Structure formats: C-alpha cells, structure tokens
Paper text:
Human NAD-IDH is a key enzyme in the TCA cycle, which catalyzes the oxidative decarboxylation of ICT into α-KG. The α and β subunits form a heterodimer (αβ), and the α and γ subunits form another heterodimer (αγ), which are assembled into a heterotetramer (α2βγ) and further into a heterooctamer (the heterotetramer and heterooctamer are also called holoenzyme). Our previous biochemical studies demonstrated that the αγ heterodimer alone exhibits a high enzymatic activity and kinetic properties comparable with those of the holoenzyme and can be activated by CIT and ADP but inhibited by NADH; on the other hand, the αβ heterodimer alone exhibits a low activity and cannot be activated by the activators but can be inhibited by NADH. Our structural comparisons show that the αβ heterodimer has a similar yet more compact overall structure compared with the αγ heterodimer and contains a pseudo-allosteric site that exhibits substantial conformational differences from the allosteric site in the αγ heterodimer.
Crystals of the αβ heterodimer with the α subunit bound with an NADH at the active site (αNADHβ) also grew at condition II with the protein solution incubated with α-KG and NADH (both 50 mm) before crystallization and belong to space group P21, and the structure was determined at 3.30 Å resolution with each asymmetric unit containing four αNADHβ molecules, which form two dimers of heterodimers via the clasp domains. The αNADHβ structure is almost identical to the αNADβ structure (superposition of the two structures yields an RMSD of 0.5 Å for about 610 Cα atoms). The NADH binding induces almost identical conformational changes of the large domain of the α subunit as the NAD binding, and the NADH retains almost identical interactions with the surrounding residues as the NAD. In the αNADβ and αNADHβ structures, most residues of the α and β subunits, including the β2-α2 and β3-α3 loops of the β subunit, are well-defined except a few residues at the N and C termini of the α and β subunits. On the other hand, the inactive overall conformation of the αNADβ and αNADHβ structures could be attributed to the NAD binding–induced conformational change at the active site and a newly established hydrogen-bonding network, which stabilize the side chain of Tyr-126A and the β5A-β6A loop in the inactive conformations and further trigger the conformational changes of the heterodimer interface and the pseudo-allosteric site.
Residue numbers in the entry:
A (entry chain A): 3 to 337
B (entry chain B): 14 to 351
The structure:
C-alpha cells in the first residue's frame, strides 16, 4: 500500500530540510504521500488559542506526522506552537534516542542513550502570571497519572528495543512531593518487571556523570519538571543539533516526529542546514510505521554518506551546501 | 591576624577542611579558624547553632564552608540546615569556576569559564501543595529585585576579574513572563558596563553548546530556574567534584565552598578523597583577604603537584590516599619559601 502522513514544514530552516527529507523519500520511492498542512499560531474564540482547523482534521485523518521546528517568540506572543501541538494530541512521551554516527568522530565514543521524557505536564502546561509588580509566580503541575504513564512507557521502550538498564532521573532532594511521587510510580512499575534493571540518580549527578562517561546510561526517564536540558546535553555527545532525531510518540500509534534542532535563524534561508535531523526523525516514522526496509536503506545511506566525508555540511566540518548534501544522500540510495 | 569562619559539615567534608588548615599550616598563612561543628547527621544542630555561626559572620565577614548533609529521609532540601544557613547570610550569586588544570587531561582541556547563577529563588522557592486526589502543584517565584541583583553582581564580577563577555542563559521562549523579566533586567543592566560584550542564549540550547564546545563562553549569568544543574554539567568538563572550586557571595559576605555539590559529591571513605576543590577555593578565599602572596603560593603549588603527575587521587587516575596527596602539597609549599 501507499500511506499518507501530515507534514508541517516549519519555520526558518523548516522548508530547507523538509524539502530535503521529502526528496530522499521521493528518491528512495517510499510508499508515502505528504499532506502539507502549515500550522501557524491562530487566535482562539475564548482567547484559548486553537489550531488551524486544516492541521487539526488533517492529523486525525492520518494519525502520523513529520514536522519541522516551529517559532516561538522571545517574550511577545503565543505560549508556544509546539506545546499546544503536543498537548492537543496527547503525545505523552518525547523519546530522544541519541546514538553515535560511526564515521563522524567526537570526543565521545559509542554512546547509545535514550531520554524518555514526559510530554504533557509540568512546565509544559501551567499558568505563569503577574502576582504583583516585579514579582512573577508560575504554577507548573505534575500528576499522579501521567507519571505512571511515562514510567510504563519507559519499561515498554526498554522492552521492545532490548535495553539493559532503565534509570529514573529525578530531583526528589529539592522537590519532595513533585518528584517523590514520580519515583513511587516508577518504583511500582519497576517491581512489575525485574526483566529490566532499574535505579534512581538525581538530575545534577547525571549531568555530571554524563559529560564524564555516557557508558553508564541506557534508558533515562524524566518528569517534564526540568524540561529536557539532559536531552540537549546528550545531543552534544553525538555530533550536533543537526544530527539528533526526536519523537512525540503517543498512544494508539499516533505520533509526530520532529528533531530537537529548532528554528535556526542564523542559517535560515542560507542553505547550510543539516537535513540529518529531520531525516533520522523520519527514519523513526518508518520504523514506527513498520516500513523497516525503506528505513534501514535510507538510514544506512545517510550514515555511509557522512562517513565518506566529501559532502558533510557546514556544522559537521566541511563547506557543503544543504542541497549538495541532500543529493549525495539521494544518489546514494537509488542503487 | 585574620579570622576565618570554617564550617566542616559532614561527609568527607571535615577531612578536606583539615587538609586546608594543614596546608595553611605548611605555608604559615596568617589566617586563624573558628570551627562551628554543625551538622544534622551527627545531630550537632539547632538554630541556636546557626545563630552562633552568624555571630561569627558579623565579625570575620568571610567564611569557607563544606556541605552539611540534609537527611532526605525526614526533611527535604529547602528546609535543610544548609538552605537555612544560606538564607541567614542572604547569600545570592553562586560563582562556579570551570577551569581545567594542566596535567589532568579531560575531553575539555584549557578551559576558563565562570558560572554565575542566582541562588535565592527559582527552584529554591518551590511551593508545593496538593490540590486533588493525586494532582501536585508547584509554585515558583521570580523577582526583578533579585535579578537586577544577579546581573549587577555578574557584570561587577566580569569587570573585577578581567573578563570580557557575559552571557545570559534564559528561557524566554516558554517562560515568557518569568525569564522575560529576567532578560529585561539583564538587558537593562547590560548597557551600564559598555566595555563588556553581552548576549542571550536559550538554556535548552546552552547545555548542548556547553558540551559541544565550552570554549565559546566566559561569564554565564542565569536565574536559578532548573536548579544547580549547569554548575554540575560544566564542572564535569574539568574533572569533577574533586577539583572545581566555588564561592557564594552576599551584599556583605563571601562563603567559599565547592562548585559541584550534588548528593554523593564525594562518597568516599576514610581518606581517598580529592582536596583540590577545597584547596583551590582556599587560595581564592585568600585572594579575597588580600593575602595575594599566600594565595599565589597554595594555588601555584597544587596546580603543579597535579601537573608533575607523581601523585594523583582515585578520581584523577592514580592510587594515593588523601593524606598522601595533601602531604605531597605541603612538601612543595614548604619549598616555595626558599
Ligand atoms: N522543536 C521546537 O519546537 C523547537 C523550537 N525552538 C524555537 O525556535 C527558536 C530556536 O532558537 P535556538 O535555540 O536559538 O535555535 P536552535 O536551537 O534551532 O539552534 C540553531 C542554532 O544552533 C545551531 N543549529 C541548530 N540546529 C541546526 C541545524 N539543523 N543545522 C545547522 N545548525 C544548527 C546553529 O548554530 C544555529 O545558530 C527559538 O524560538 C526556540 O524557542 C527551539 C528549539 C526546539
């Protein structure tokens, strides 16, 4: 068959890479059609900012999505397009795999790390308001429920993808109630399965134990109370933001796949972006979609390109245009 | 001549403290110490013990402290005796010095980077009240008055220590009101010292950049959102909680500690702990006292006993005890007189 999937181009280097990754699928003739649905910040009737109805009905029709990064204003406008986007689809899990690129060497070797971070609670969704002049209060809440829901996802991921350890990153020293709960929910599901080996490290220790040696970490699970400073840290071991993919897995197989790399204003429209992010993002799509062999073809293509070294893009150590990159990878796939 | 309030605390902490005072003995450093032997794991603790601490801080106005060990099985952290102390001194402005040491190779060598974070609110104001059957709520506060404070301190530290750039790591994107305010203040104070480059970085991105290349930075000022993490992440570039000094300042005080102070910072036993953090923080304390001569000596000694490679503790790749590594330093301190 020939499946279809929503596509949000995104803002900035959205078009550059979304065009690039569209064309590797095209070149590779994968059974995907793209239903482009520009989702922009659109005001709400009651002031509760809704979604472009175009993308809201379009995604329910495909239950799948690849998306470029959206733009959030520095202090002047929409709360964020991504937060609202993840929440109004209950994509309760932001899986950030993080593995090396064999041919592209960093100071870190053989790093296979996965951040499973919860995606619909904590600082994602809350009031922040002006209580008096010059004093701001913020009201981030965490639940008992989704705590359990991500800590089940943790062991389920580590169960499908054959993982040794699952370690709960938490800050129960400085937030007794909030993250003391989460452990309790982790602890409960971790007893359910001695299948997977478990522990609990505090967040500051991990970030230190991490830049020292990412050989001690398999899967990580986190409440969205400390956002994903860990996930972007780990994206410094691999290579760059240009090479890390990311996944808003949700229930019922709905998922939006994007990359950590954001709006990228500096190199907007300059044609020096990295398509490796949105690409390996879409290689999660297929491997999530069951299209395993369009996956390993495209994926292993992008690696062998990188290893050869003659076309790797600007942030990877070579003056090579995002376009010329995307066709060395295109040509590479076809035979 | 020069009294310094010394708080050993608990952990391997009291051992390091010893090492600092023994090395001061070797160098003959006209600093005499009042130890306050305050701790909750050993139950030498009350607020009457804290008061005696601050009665000490009124006079000497300058103190070197360890980490007091909160018992997380009953209390938390914002009610630790360590937070309760930090409070009484109106400490703000944590100063962490991320500087690699020549002869301790890491993945981040020749690095020179100082991490200013606000130490009074943000995560440390966490108000937590349960609202439902199982809905926890977390209330956090940001104030223009505590931020205009952290950036004037930051800039005044940039000028005072020769440093030319100052970055403001901020989360304006989603925290549009808390860290919008923080940026507004930072931008405000940022014109006032126009001999200093200023720039803003979203925090998310910065922890990636902090490990993809820390060499792009110099002075980092940030609100206390997210906690003491980034101090600890950077402090790994330079070889760990065994070596990265730290200091915490006040309007009127200066408390000299260690940069990276996670739980199980040094979960070593008898001996077998590194004292480079304490010692490099002692000399920095000494510089504060304008004993620059004795600050030079201690500092330049232990930056070289670890360059020469003969003695090395567990964490730096070596076999020696702490007694052995501190006694190596005395020998090279005693030499440096003549
Ligand atoms: N997924 C999302 O929704 C995200 C959205 N954003 C938003 O977009 C804007 C982005 O801000 P920043 O963090 O400064 O941008 P960013 O995180 O996208 O960083 C781009 C910068 O980092 C490097 N970079 C990142 N990705 C790259 C790539 N693919 N190719 C080449 N270089 C790359 C470049 O040096 C560039 O200057 C912000 O408004 C932010 O809120 C940021 C991150 C993620």
């Amino acid at each position: 068959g020939v499946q279809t999937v929503t596509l949000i181009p995104g803002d900035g280097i959205g078009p550059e890479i979304s065009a690039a990754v569209m064309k590797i699928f095209d070149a590779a003739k994968a059974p995907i059609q793209w239903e482009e649905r520009n989702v922009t910040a659109i005001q709400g009737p009651g002031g509760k900012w809704m979604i472009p109805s175009e993308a809201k009905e379009s995604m329910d029709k495909n239950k799948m999505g690849l998306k470029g990064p959206l733009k959030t204003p520095i202090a002047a406008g929409h709360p964020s397009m991504n937060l609202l986007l993840r929440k109004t689809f209950d994509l309760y899990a932001n899986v950030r795999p993080c593995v090396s690129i064999e041919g592209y060497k960093t100071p870190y070797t053989d790093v296979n790390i996965v951040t499973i971070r919860e995606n619909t609670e904590g600082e994602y969704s809350g009031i922040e308001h002006v209580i008096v002049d010059g004093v701001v209060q913020s009201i981030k809440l965490i639940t008992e429920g989704a705590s359990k829901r991500i800590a089940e996802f943790a062991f389920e991921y580590a169960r499908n993808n054959h993982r040794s350890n699952v370690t709960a990153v938490h800050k129960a020293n400085i937030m007794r109630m909030s993250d003391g709960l989460f452990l309790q929910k982790c602890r409960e599901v971790a007893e359910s399965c001695k299948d997977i080996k478990f522990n609990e490290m505090y967040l500051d220790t991990v970030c230190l134990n991490m830049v020292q040696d990412p050989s001690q970490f398999d899967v990580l699970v986190m409440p969205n109370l400390y956002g994903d400073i860990l996930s972007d840290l780990c994206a410094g071991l691999i290579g760059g933001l240009g090479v890390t993919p990311s996944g808003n897995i949700g229930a019922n197989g709905v998922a939006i796949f994007e990359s950590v790399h954001g709006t990228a204003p500096d190199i907007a429209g300059k044609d020096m972006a990295n398509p490796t992010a949105l690409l390996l993002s879409a290689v999660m799509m297929l491997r999530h979609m069951g299209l395993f062999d369009h996956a390993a073809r495209i994926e292993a293509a992008c690696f062998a390109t990188i290893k050869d070294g003659k076309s790797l893009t600007k942030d990877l150590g070579g003056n090579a245009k995002c376009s010329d990159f995307t066709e060395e990878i295109c040509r590479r796939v076809k035979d | 001549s020069f009294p310094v309030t010394m708080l050993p605390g608990d952990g391997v902490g009291p051992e390091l403290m010893h090492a600092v005072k023994e090395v001061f003995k070797a160098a003959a450093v006209p600093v005499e110490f009042q130890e306050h032997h305050l701790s909750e794991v050993q139950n030498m603790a009350s607020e009457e013990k804290l008061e005696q601490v601050l009665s000490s801080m009124k006079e000497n106005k300058v103190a070197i402290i360890g980490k007091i060990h909160t018992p997380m099985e009953y209390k938390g952290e914002l009610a630790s005796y360590d937070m309760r102390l930090r409070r009484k001194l109106d400490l703000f402005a944590n100063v962490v010095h991320v500087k690699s040491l020549p002869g301790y190779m890491t993945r981040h060598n020749n690095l020179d980077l100082v991490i200013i974070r606000e130490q009074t609110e943000g995560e440390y104001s966490s108000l937590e009240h349960e609202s439902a059957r199982g809905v926890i709520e977390c209330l956090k506060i940001v104030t223009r008055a505590k931020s205009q404070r952290i950036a004037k301190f930051a800039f005044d530290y940039a000028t005072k220590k020769g440093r030319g750039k100052v970055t403001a790591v901020h989360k304006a994107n989603i925290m549009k009101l808390g860290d919008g305010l923080f940026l507004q203040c930072c931008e405000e104070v940022a014109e006032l010292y126009p001999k200093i480059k200023f720039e803003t970085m979203i925090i998310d991105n910065c922890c990636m950049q902090l490990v993809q290349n820390p060499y792009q930075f110099d002075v980092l000022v940030m609100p206390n959102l997210y906690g003491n993490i980034i101090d600890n992440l950077a402090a790994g570039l330079v070889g760990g909680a065994g070596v990265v000094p730290g200091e915490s300042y006040s309007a009127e005080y200066a408390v000299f500690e260690t940069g990276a102070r996670h739980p199980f910072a040094q979960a070593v036993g008898r001996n077998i702990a590194n004292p480079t953090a304490m010692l490099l923080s002692a000399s920095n304390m000494l510089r504060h006292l304008n004993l620059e001569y004795h600050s030079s000596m201690i500092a330049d000694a232990v930056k070289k006993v670890i360059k020469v490679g003969k003695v090395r503790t567990s964490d730096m790749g070596g076999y020696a005890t702490c007694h052995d590594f501190t006694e190596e330093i005395c020998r090279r301190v005693k030499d440096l007189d003549e």
